[PDB]
Design a protein around this ligand. Structure first.
Ligand code: NA
Ligand code: NA
Lengths: 310, 310
């Protein structure tokens, strides 16, 4: 498997593929991603950190941006409280076995040089484009603040200031990244990860929506979450359980079933799993049971590293 | 005449009068006003500098903000070009006989402390309120930039940062100042000057509209400007010539007329002038002639100080 294909695997898009080609040649190449500090670290975070680990294994230096100032602008509270949580997030990522450097946005986002460029970019950025870029990101507010249109230009300027080759983020970030590619002199290669569906299937997974599995959820908690989860027979799209199977499980996957229901099933790939499920040849209870047990195993080392802190 | 009434004279409003009362008590009191550097300095500028001179005579320390960064945000060009013009504006104000300290916005508007508060204020400032505050200020643009909503919070933060007691500006600034009074812990007393009508009477006077008399216009230029100016018999409102008489001329004013047209008229106050003109008892040609000659005299020392530079 290519380093390219290893990097491309399970991404929603690379902007652009030929551009990524060029970067892979280099000895020195860097990639960063920003995270607003979150009270719980969930599968969504995990998916992205897994992609950063991919990049690290292809020889990228990795920078995690602990986005205290962006979180501040996106109404997550006071900065000092925001930074404390960022520190906790850092520990979780390390328990994920990521080898990276961690930087707080505010370490550089208030330098005079950075600020001056925020204002330069603000002259090039229409209010309509700025608001369009925040539709999937901004905290819901009946009375949108000026902060909301400041956010995207912070994210763009940061890509510029730190001189990174590759920016990684969820699909919700794509309009900001297209703005960055258009407004900056050096085009940053953008890799976008899919946004996981929440457990009830009604929206995207989100640490503010209570529709996630956190990486340190107890095994009984994990089982109950999955048991309740949206998962219609034959329905793959918008199905969070199938998403967990696609994004986190390793194959071949043995699905344990009673003999009376067809006995143990061994699936060699996710594509084969998808066809079984679509054919209504694998029942949601059996899929749920396996995903839950295998996910528990996957997240075990992470929970244990966090638990040993006491 | 009160110091209060001397300060109040020819202002559109004081926010608020009782607040200004309190400030006048102090030994140390400061007032500032910001100017976007302008290629020509006109009667509009002059009116405001005259009001600053009023404040200076009531014992205020005066600060002129050479607003290079605001001008930068309001699409007036590159900063280095903006600052050069600011320097020229400074010289014109000194030739007006103003005794003040002059500061460039950018001397302090990129400090880390200032910037951080711009972001704090941006969290309190709705996009709708911010755009409403810029309706009379923003350079026309079919595609409004994020810079436009950054401007009002710069102006608000500057009032905060420099700790000024009194902010002065034209009426067009009033929504920004109300925002400042609501968002800041210390309420700044705001004094608003009327906005002069352009010479053709079709809009407000403005150095980008070519409807002004500049303080250093030649006497023949001044006469031709006035001769062409909008000035209907009996019509006071929106009449720039009457505005010049109200705001710049001293009384008693002798209006010279041929004997065949009623001979020389001596008016003791602007209110008396207004009633003469409304009654169609003073013809626009005679009013124009006098305003032009007296304005020429008024602006003479200013033109001469600038001319001696060569
Ligand atoms: Na090498
Ligand atoms: Na004293």
């Amino acid at each position: 498997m290519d380093e390219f294909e290893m990097i491309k695997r399970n991404t929603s898009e690379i902007i652009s593929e030929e551009e990524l080609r060029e970067v892979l040649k280099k000895d020195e190449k860097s990639a960063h991603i920003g995270f607003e500090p979150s009270g719980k670290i969930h599968l969504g975070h995990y998916l992205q950190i897994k992609k950063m680990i991919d990049l690290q294994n292809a020889g990228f230096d990795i920078i995690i941006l602990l986005a205290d100032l962006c979180a501040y602008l996106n109404q997550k509270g006071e900065l000092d409280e925001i930074r404390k949580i960022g520190d906790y997030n850092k520990k979780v990522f390390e328990a994920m076995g990521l080898k990276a450097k961690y930087v707080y946005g505010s370490e550089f986002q208030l330098d005079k040089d950075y600020t001056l460029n925020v204002y330069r970019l603000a002259l090039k950025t229409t209010l309509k484009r700025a608001r369009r870029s925040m539709e999937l990101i901004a905290r819901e507010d009946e009375n949108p603040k000026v902060a909301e249109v400041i956010y995207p230009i912070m994210q763009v300027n940061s890509a510029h200031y730190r001189g990174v080759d590759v920016a990684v983020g969820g699909m919700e970030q794509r309009k900001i990244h297209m703005l960055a590619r258009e407004l900056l002199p050096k085009k940053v290669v953008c890799i976008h990860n899919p946004v996981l569906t929440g457990l009830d299937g009604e929206g995207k997974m989100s640490s503010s929506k209570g529709n996630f599995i956190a990486v340190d959820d107890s095994p009984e908690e994990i089982r109950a979450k999955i048991k309740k989860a949206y998962c219609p027979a034959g329905v793959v799209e918008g199905n969070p359980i199938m998403e967990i199977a696609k994004y986190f499980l390793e194959y071949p996957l043995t699905i344990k079933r009673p003999e009376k229901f067809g006995g143990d099933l061994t699936v060699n790939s996710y594509e084969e799993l998808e066809s079984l499920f679509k054919n209504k040849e694998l029942h949601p209870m059996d899929l749920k049971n396996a995903v839950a047990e295998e996910l528990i195993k996957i997240l075990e080392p992470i929970r244990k590293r966090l638990l040993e802190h006491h």
